[PDB]
Every structure is written in C-alpha cells, then in structure tokens.
Amino acid sequence: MVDLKIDVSDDEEAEKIIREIREQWPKATVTRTNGDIKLDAQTEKEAEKMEKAVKKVKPNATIRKTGGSLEHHHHHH
C-alpha cells in the first residue's frame, strides 16, 4: 500500500481525479473531501500510474506520497 493524498483547488478537476482513477481502478479508495483526495495505491508501480492519472488532469499536481516501501539503501543503486 502507498499513501497518495492529492491536493484539489477546484471542484470540477476533483471530479476528474475521481473519474480518471476509478475508471482503471474501481477498488481504489477515493475519498472526495473539499480540499484533498484521500487515495490508496496497492504497490509503488501502482502509485506511479495513479499519481500520473491525476497529472493527466493537472501536470503540476501536488501529491502527498507517504510509505510505499522502506527502500533498503544497500539494495539501492
């Protein structure tokens, strides 16, 4: 699981976040809340696609990405 919280400054784009996520991922918990979008990804790659689908509405989308994985630096280039 990857924590994805998408800031939303407008109502219509917030609608577009929900549609562009849930059309591919019906299981993706999208909690519509005036101010943000509370979203949960399954894996890191899944998050890469999810946050990208948001960026298909808004390229400079401020997305709060927490957790994902404890990327072990000895196993990291």
* Technique that determined the structure: NMR
Domain map (residue ranges) of the chain: 1-77
Please report how the helices 11-22 and 44-55 are oriented relative to each other, as an axis angle in degrees rounded to 10. 140
Closest to 63 in 3D by CA, of 9, 4, 16: 4
What stretches of the chain adopt beta strand conformation (E)?
2-7, 30-33, 36-41, 63-67
Name 36's Cβ contacts closer than 8 Å, sequence gap at least 6: 5, 6, 7, 8
